């Protein structure tokens, strides 16, 4: 393997007259020495085995100014001796790196002129790359660019290659990968914000697809049921999607590929009848589920401004959900009522037994209902959150925030109210103890139903988001205090003499919690003659308790303080928004088939020929850029 | 360049790539390999880690006649290497030291609200137990010895504090004192106790005040309370 | 910066045996006659494109 070992060295260096001199020894060898199996030989003297890495792979892995050379006496030793089927189409063997060709390789490395050349010798188009670094799991084992040349040279922004594979037969646009995705779910994949990747994702998504005039790629099912469109939705892609949406293909033979058919214009004011295909909620999986349930991803709100969904989420409101949502705060303000005129009145009372929510039972007609509409609701919840509980795919956060702080609330409070009566039931006096929470629980609760009734709402968000991450960190170092500083006088209090009984406030340890708990709050009296060893000590740590409790509330107003001036104005009205999306498609998943059906949005067109598809009409103004709107749908410009 | 404190040609001497060929031997940035977008850049490391004697990591920490050690700390052969030491090995020792100096503070306090909290003829707070029960030998033992443990201890950190220039205030040694404040409270008092003096138990009690208020200072491991105990 | 001080603290503290086992680093064969630790460290990078020629391993990745 002297020659074969050489031959790798010279296509590294760049010497190509020291290439020629063993071009020809291998061509003279070969004609005598291992004759009979000659293309395989003279490839296995070629062949880098264990890798499967030929000269032509060595040459280009490897660029230097003397490259384009070094190809060609390759390629024409390969017609001479007739192997240039395998001597192109080799791959690696190893699982770490396979499928990857010269293809592969010229299209990394920018050599965009030998890329012409290759192909054109005949290279397989429609490769693969099914390795591990071409598949990594975790980030930064490898790249992702999805198996096929043309997304690598579509992925890493060389459109003069995309175009030259395009126009090339054999070249399978409908193709699929490993994990099932096309070539447009693999541009969704590797597609980050205009702080990174700067726009050429949105240029080449849009040029594969208008060369492509079907409907077929973006109707590709990957292997888990997803679409490009619903790809881009769950990874976060916001800037994909603002244009996937909003399309308009102006240049005829192409306006079927759109979905901003414009309704008519005239002058300013103009008609886009946006689509609803897969963004409503009448099929499976679409934009509006996945965009407001998913919790894996940050910039959902980002995404709601997308607009056939803000114009959708809104238009539900008014017709069904604001309603739902009144009707939910009546019967829940009835409960509570319920709940709290027993709690005050049957409890504050004893004779032998009072049964506090059980079957009345000689009671009148007014405390039957009253009880019975407590059980029946109470059992409600207990039920119905528990499914909120089991279809909790974990909330990224926790209990904690963007939702299910409230749904545990709620379930906590159906449990206490039926667990009482069962602990009643059998014999226990437990009962009070579980009503009393369920009262507290239940009042704090209807705090919830602020959400549809703006600004409430986003101030119900700002106490959420405070009592999370300032007050916890607040209590946690206020208790070591507390506790710390309450021993120290709580020892140094001394003799109580029983002839002189309460002898001091600061007596046991359970006393100096509190006596120093009131004194923060700014409650209760004060006198440093308590009975101690030491009056000079005992208020030493007193004054103590003062400045470093007061130091922290500083820290406090401050901290939040450092938290409003950024936060507020775009923090609470975009989560507002978000919850309310929630809200709405909650009781949307509710509806029976019946009344659905009738309040199913949406209004039929004629957007082409052949074509009938759900629109959504959204008018607007704009004055700023002007244009002789050509354009049109319906000629004339108007409604009727 | 790391002691004066000069941050821009410190970015230029760590991250420093000779592209051109017969010079790349004097390069700190050798790529390991390029694939597209993704790449790997391995950094040196010769004279930047702790394995040889004044370096880097320990003039650009231990440092403060100068005020921008903070802009110095991103330059990177030192930012992934500050937290992998923490992933391996220092994450653990501050959990296994905040373990014993809870474990400590608990011992000094269910001592302290027991025994003081009476008076027969005399009680020996914290000395050699003598008569107890074995609950209460590790308890007493554990404190003298970890007592005079911090004792010693931060008195090196002590005598080791080449002025760091604003004072005993921040960018560390408000905290080395009251360490030292409070270990010398306790041993002091068992020798107080020891002759005769009734002056014990005004001790013991500043070394459990003083003692929970530094529990404050193991927080620093654990984000966003670390950024609070700055505040 | 505080947190900076604790880890070398800590490393101040370890014996031989145990500093040298934790050790940071790996070897690399930078050039010919030249041996140093190293540093490997990731990278992201899409705005800037170039048709990459320095490397020290022509095979792309670990392993
Ligand atoms: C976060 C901490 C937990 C939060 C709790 C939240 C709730 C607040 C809790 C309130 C509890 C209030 C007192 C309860 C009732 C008394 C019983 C008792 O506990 O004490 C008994 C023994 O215990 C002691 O004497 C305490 C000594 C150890 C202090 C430990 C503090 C640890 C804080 C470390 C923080 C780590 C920070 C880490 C930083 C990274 C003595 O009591 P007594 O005199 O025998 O009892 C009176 C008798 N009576 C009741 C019949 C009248
Ligand atoms: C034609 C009528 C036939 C009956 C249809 C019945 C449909 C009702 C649906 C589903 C039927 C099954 C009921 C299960 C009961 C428990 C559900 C539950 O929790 O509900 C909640 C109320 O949610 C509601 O949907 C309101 C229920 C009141 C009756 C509405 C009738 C009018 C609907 C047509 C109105 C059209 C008006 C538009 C203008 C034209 C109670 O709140 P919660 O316990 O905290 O629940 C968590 C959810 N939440 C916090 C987000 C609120
Ligand atoms: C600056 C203004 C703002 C901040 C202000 C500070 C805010 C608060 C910060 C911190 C809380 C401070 C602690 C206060 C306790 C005082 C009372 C005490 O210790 O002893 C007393 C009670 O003792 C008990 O009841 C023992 C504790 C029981 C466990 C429940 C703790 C409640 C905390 C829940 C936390 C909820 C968290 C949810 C929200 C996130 C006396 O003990 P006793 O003798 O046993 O009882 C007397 C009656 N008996 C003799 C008849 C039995
Ligand atoms: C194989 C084990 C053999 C033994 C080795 C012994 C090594 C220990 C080192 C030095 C030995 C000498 C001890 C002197 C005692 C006083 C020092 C001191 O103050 O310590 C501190 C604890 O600091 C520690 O280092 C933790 C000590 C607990 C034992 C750790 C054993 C496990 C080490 C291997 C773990 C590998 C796990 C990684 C995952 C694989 C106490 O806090 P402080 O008093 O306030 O001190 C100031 C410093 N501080 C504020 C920054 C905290
Ligand atoms: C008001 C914002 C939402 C809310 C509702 C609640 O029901 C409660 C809330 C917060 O905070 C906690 C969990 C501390 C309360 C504990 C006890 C009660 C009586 C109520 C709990
Ligand atoms: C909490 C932040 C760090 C800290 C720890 C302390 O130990 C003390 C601190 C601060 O402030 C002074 C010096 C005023 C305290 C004096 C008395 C006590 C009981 C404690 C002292």
Redesign the interface.
Same mark, same amino acid.
């Given at each position: 393997r002297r020659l074969k070992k050489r031959i790798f060295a010279a296509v590294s260096e760049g010497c190509v007259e020291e290439l020629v001199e063993l071009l020809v020894e291998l061509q003279e060898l070969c004609r005598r020495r291992h004759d009979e199996d000659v293309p395989d030989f003279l490839m296995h003297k070629l062949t880098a085995s264990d890798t499967g890495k030929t000269c032509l792979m060595k040459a280009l *892995? $490897? &660029? $230097?100014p003397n490259t384009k050379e070094i190809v060609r006496i390759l390629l024409a030793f390969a017609e001479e001796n007739d192997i240039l089927g395998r001597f192109i189409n080799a791959e690696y063997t190893e699982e770490? +790196?396979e499928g990857q060709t010269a293809l592969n390789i010229a299209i990394?490395?920018?050599?965009g002129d030998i890329a012409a050349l290759l192909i054109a010798a005949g290279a397989d188009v429609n490769a693969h790359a099914k390795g591990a670094?071409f598949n990594p799991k975790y980030?930064?084992? %490898?790249?992702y #660019?999805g198996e096929t040349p043309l997304a !690598?040279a579509a992925?890493?922004?060389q459109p003069e290659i995309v175009q030259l594979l395009m126009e090339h037969e054999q070249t399978d646009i409908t193709s699929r990968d490993s994990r099932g995705n096309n070539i447009l779910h693999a541009l969704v994949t590797v597609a980050?914000d205009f702080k990174?990747?700067?726009d050429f994702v949105k240029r080449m998504y849009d040029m594969i697809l208008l060369r492509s005039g079907n409907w077929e790629l973006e109707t590709t099912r990957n292997n888990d049921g997803l679409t490009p469109l619903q790809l881009a939705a769950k990874m976060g892609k916001a800037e994909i999607l603002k244009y996937i949406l909003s399309r308009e293909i102006k240049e005829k033979r192409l306006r079927s590929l759109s979905r901003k058919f414009t309704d008519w214009a005239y002058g300013p004011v103009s008609s886009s009848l946006y689509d609803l295909t897969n963004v409503d909620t009448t099929t499976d999986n679409s934009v509006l589920e996945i965009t407001v349930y998913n919790t894996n991803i940050d910039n959902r709100h980002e995404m709601l401004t997308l607009e056939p969904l803000h114009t959708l989420l809104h238009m539900k409101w008014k017709k069904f959900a604001k309603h739902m949502f009144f009707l939910s705060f009546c019967f829940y303000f009835f409960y509570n009522i319920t709940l709290t005129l027993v709690s005050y009145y049957r409890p504050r009372e004893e004779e032998a037994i009072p049964h506090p929510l059980a079957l009345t039972h000689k009671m009148g007609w007014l405390q039957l209902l009253g009880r019975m509409f407590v059980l029946i609701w109470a059992m409600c919840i207990s039920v119905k959150e528990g499914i909120a509980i089991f279809l909790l795919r974990p909330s990224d956060l926790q209990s904690i925030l963007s939702d299910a702080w409230f749904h545990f609330v709620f379930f906590i409070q159906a449990v206490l109210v039926i667990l009482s009566v069962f602990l009643y039931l059998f014999a226990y006096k437990e009962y009070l103890a579980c009503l009393v929470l369920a009262m507290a629980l239940g009042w704090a609760n209807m705090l919830y139903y602020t959400r549809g009734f703006q600004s409430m709402g986003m101030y119900s968000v700002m106490i959420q988001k405070v009592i999370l991450h300032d007050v916890l960190?607040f209590l946690? /170092?206020y208790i /070591? #205090?507390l !506790? %710390?500083?309450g /021993?120290?006088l709580?020892? *140094? &209090?001394?003799?109580c003499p029983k002839d002189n009984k309460d002898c001091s406030s600061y007596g046991s340890?359970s006393d100096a919690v509190l006596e120093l708990f009131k004194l923060t709050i700014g409650l209760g009296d004060l006198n440093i003659q308590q009975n101690s060893? +030491?009056p000079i *000590?005992f208020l030493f *740590?007193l004054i103590?308790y003062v400045i !470093?409790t007061f130091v922290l509330l500083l820290?406090m107003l &401050?901290?939040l303080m450092g938290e409003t001036v950024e936060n507020v104005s775009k923090e609470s009205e975009r989560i507002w928004r978000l919850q309310r999306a929630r809200t709405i498609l909650e009781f949307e998943k509710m509806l029976p088939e019946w009344l659905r059906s009738r309040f199913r949005m949406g209004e039929l067109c004629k957007v082409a020929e052949d074509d009938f598809r759900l629109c959504l009409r959204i008018n607007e103004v704009k004055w700023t850029e002007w244009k002789t709107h050509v354009s049109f749908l319906n000629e004339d410009p108007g409604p009727v």
């Open positions: *892995l $490897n &660029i $230097n770490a +790196y990394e490395r920018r050599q670094f980030q930064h084992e %490898g790249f #660019f !690598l992925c890493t922004n980050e990174t990747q700067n960190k946690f /170092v /070591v #205090f !506790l %710390g500083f /021993v120290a709580a020892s *140094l &209090i001394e003799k340890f060893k +030491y *000590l *740590l103590t !470093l820290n &401050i901290a």
